[PDB]
Amino acid sequence: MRRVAVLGAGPSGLTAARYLKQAGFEVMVFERYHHVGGTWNYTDETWMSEDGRPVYSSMYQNLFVNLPKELMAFPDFPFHDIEGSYVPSKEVLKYFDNFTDAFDLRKLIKLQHHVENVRPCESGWLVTVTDLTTMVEHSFEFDAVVVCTGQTWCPLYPDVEGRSFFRGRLTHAHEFRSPEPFRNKRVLIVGAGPSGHDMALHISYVSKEVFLSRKLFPDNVTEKPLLTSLSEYTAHFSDGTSTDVDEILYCTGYRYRFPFLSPECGVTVDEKYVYPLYLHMLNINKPTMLFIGVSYNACYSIMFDLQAQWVTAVLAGRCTLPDAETMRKEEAEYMEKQRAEAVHPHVLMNHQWEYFKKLEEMSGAKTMPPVYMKMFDDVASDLVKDLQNFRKNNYMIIDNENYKKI
């Protein structure tokens, strides 16, 4: 166990590379874009790039973070000193470029390399990639592979009665880049929890009327219950109401999609479920393949930090895992409990802190500063509770235990 492939140089991939490199592995990171940082990169491009491969970023113009920069930074790599907690996206991109440079990761990253296929070979892995600058295909052999390609690029559209009758413009959150196409339009946003809050707000500034449909806002945003059918130009809702709309915008999230995974990798990828994974990371069938960033709805800084340290510990043999039968059993029990609590398989929100404590114990990682939990539990929901104003709040962490509002 020496040569490890990292697939993706977004936050997940970058974190993995730091820990794997520190642990003495020979790391190679493949990234299709020309810049690290994942979806924090903004591009005018959507769906497919002119370079011939998908656009993976769903970033849009003028986005600000929905969590204070103080909680988005890794505990041992603070954000650059810039005024304000709720920074524009470019500051987060800058953060990951610095992070990459700080840990001497850049030399490990093959930019504009699009991973096309991954398959088991002997006990290791064969990774096939295209160098998009030459269009030459390259194959590389590795002892382990860490999949960090994200899950905010392949859109999910929930089925709705009559959807195929609708004649207005239908788009997904993935391709949202600016509110301009929605100017003076009657817009229905189909959302889930907080998924459509920010886009509703952005669109409210240019559109005639916004309808936010889900199973606080500006005056021209009208909340609606569940969308129940569509007709040619009209939306019908669970309350028996209906409204005419020119545009429908699905803020209905994404599905897992890992096109490069050959069936022999032993991973089954369904819309909301990737299996069989232990702790959302380890491929139970082929345990030298691991994923970072499959789990979601959590304090991501800590999640990335810990999953990278856990993956690293497993590959270095410092973490001894239960046998496969036990891992399948624990996974099975975990997933039954997800269903009982009515959340999707890889959603961490209800138990993230306990999950992180487990990762800490198994990986040998430094314990997380409790202030992350206190601050997160206090402010994470502010988007849904004080959408128009929460980003004016500024915070400063005082010590390992406490923070304050400025």
Ligand X SMILES: Cc1cc2nc3c(=O)[nH]c(=O)nc-3n(C[C@H](O)[C@H](O)[C@H](O)COP(=O)(O)OP(=O)(O)OC[C@H]3O[C@@H](n4cnc5c(N)ncnc54)[C@H](O)[C@@H]3O)c2cc1C
Q: Is 31 annotated as a binding residue?
A: yes
Burial 279-308 (b: 16+ CB within 10 A, else e): bbbbbbbbbbbbbbbbbbbbbbbbbbbbbb
Instruction: Tell me which residues touch ligand X (CB under 6 A).
Output: 8-13, 30-33, 38-39, 56, 58-59, 63, 65-67, 72, 114-115, 148-150, 152, 260, 293, 300
Which own/partner pairs from 396-404 qualify as long-range (CB within 8 Å, at least 24 positions apart)? 396/70, 397/70, 397/369, 397/371, 398/371, 399/371, 400/369, 400/370, 400/371, 401/369, 401/370, 401/371, 401/374, 402/371, 402/374, 403/70, 403/371, 403/374, 403/375
Q: Is 333 annotated as a binding residue?
A: no
Q: Contact, 16 vs 294, CB < 8 A? A: no
Closest to ligand X by CB, 149 vs 288, is: 149
At its nearest, how many Å lie between Mg ion and the CB of residue 366?
A: 7
Residues 166-225 that bind its own copies (CB under 8 A): 167-169
Q: Contact, 277 vs 334, CB < 8 A? A: no
Residues 219-238 that bind its own copies (CB under 8 A): 231-233
* 3-state class (DSSP) for residue 167: coil
E strand intervals along 89-240: 109-111, 113-121, 124-131, 136-142, 144-147, 169-172, 186-191, 209-213, 221-224, 227-230, 234-237
Find which of its own copies, ligand X, Mg ion, none residue 150 binds, CB within 5 to 8 Å per kind.
ligand X
Q: Is 204 annotated as a binding residue?
A: no
At its nearest, how many Å lie between ligand X and the CB of residue 96?
A: 9
Closest to ligand X by CB, 30 vs 275, is: 30
At its nearest, how many Å lie between its own copies and the CB of residue 255?
A: 9
* Stretch touching its own copies by CB under 8 A, among 2-10, 44-52, 81-89, 380-388: 44-52
The yes or no reply on residue 128 touching its own copies (CB under 8 A) is no
Q: Is 12 annotated as a binding residue?
A: yes
Q: Is 195 annotated as a binding residue?
A: yes
Q: Is 391 annotated as a binding residue?
A: yes
Q: Contact, 316 vs 302, CB < 8 A? A: no
- Which amino acid makes up residue 337? K
Binding-site residues for FAD:
12, 31, 39, 56, 66, 115
Binding-site residues for NADP(+):
64, 66, 195, 215, 391
Please report, as ranges, the residues that interact with Mg ion according to CB under 5 A: 360
Please report, as ranges, the residues that interact with its own copies according to CB under 8 A: 47-48, 52-55, 154-155, 157, 164-165, 167-169, 231-233, 244, 246, 257, 259
